[PDB]
Amino acid sequence: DLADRFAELARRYDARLGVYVPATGTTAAIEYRADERFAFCSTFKAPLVAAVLHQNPLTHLDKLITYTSDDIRSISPVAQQHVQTGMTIGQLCDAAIRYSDGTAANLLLADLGGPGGGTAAFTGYLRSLGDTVSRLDAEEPELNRDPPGDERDTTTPHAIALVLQQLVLGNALPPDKRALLTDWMARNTTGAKRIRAGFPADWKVIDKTGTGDYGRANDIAVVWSPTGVPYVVAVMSDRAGGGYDAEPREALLAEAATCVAGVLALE
Numbered sequence: 001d002l003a004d005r006f007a008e009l010a011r012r013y014d015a016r017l018g019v020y021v022p023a024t025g026t027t028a029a030i031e032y033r034a035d036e037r038f039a040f041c042s043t044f045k046a047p048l049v050a051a052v053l054h055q056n057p058l059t060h061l062d063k064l065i066t067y068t069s070d071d072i073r074s075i076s077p078v079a080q081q082h083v084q085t086g087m088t089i090g091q092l093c094d095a096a097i098r099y100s101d102g103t104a105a106n107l108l109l110a111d112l113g114g115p116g117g118g119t120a121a122f123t124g125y126l127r128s129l130g131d132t133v134s135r136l137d138a139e140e141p142e143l144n145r146d147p148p149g150d151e152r153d154t155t156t157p158h159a160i161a162l163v164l165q166q167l168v169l170g171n172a173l174p175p176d177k178r179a180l181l182t183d184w185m186a187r188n189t190t191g192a193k194r195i196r197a198g199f200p201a202d203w204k205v206i207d208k209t210g211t212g213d214y215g216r217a218n219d220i221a222v223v224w225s226p227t228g229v230p231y232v233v234a235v236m237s238d239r240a241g242g243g244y245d246a247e248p249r250e251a252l253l254a255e256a257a258t259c260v261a262g263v264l265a266l267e
Contacts, residue, residue, distance in 0.1 A: 041210025074102025198257020215239025
């Protein structure tokens with residue numbers, strides 16, 4: 001019935017929905033269009049921070065990065081206040097996740113280095129976690145704006161959910177690096193109307209949002225039951241039939257999350 005409930009919800013919002021919740025010891029995987037491609041949009045910033053943590057000792061977080069006004073070409077709530085001061089790698093990770101700061105993300109991509117301003121290095125990191133699906137080809141803001149047919153800058157709910165599983169619940173990062181990523185996602189400022197709005201207040205939610213053209217609205221989360229049982233939740237959406245300026249619908253993600261929460265709850 002639950003694939004039917006997701007299909008009804010998507011029809012009612014005039015959208016395409018994708019959902020993946022990985023299996024646990026006690027729960028089946030939840031999958032709806034889970035192997036269909038969707039744009040990352042800013043959801044890639046969570047694994048990008050993991051890539052920078054993975055590659056470097058934690059002393060690297062104190063490295064100062066300077067930049068100029070020419071580096072601000074995407075929504076950058078933190079980096080546009082620090083053009084004259086610069087920002088540390090740690091401050092950039094914080095901004096990339098908690099404020100979805102595009103300049104911060106582009107500077108972290110450059111910190112990974114190599115062809116395409118770091119986009120190849122980012123993609124290679126996802127390949128190292130066994131993700132052969134996802135790809136990042138463009139920096140901010142172009143990666144939000146590919147037409148629906150373009151595989152560039154896309155992932156699948158399945159792929160990104162298993163990446164996030166590995167990073168937050170698995171062994172991809174040592175505990176100190178894992179704790180930094182977890183905390184930044186836990187204090188994200190952008191996600192109140194998405195997966196967070198679909199889970200009861202006694203569930204902890206950590207997340208990273210994404211938003212873009214063609215009605216794209218995404219959220220990737222790790223949630224903790226009131227008794228400390230964790231689950232990964234990936235919800236992706238777009239509205240290819242509404243044009244490049246279709247309105248993203250945050251509440252569709254909240255409603256899909258409500259359905260997920262209904263199946264995961266155990267009173």
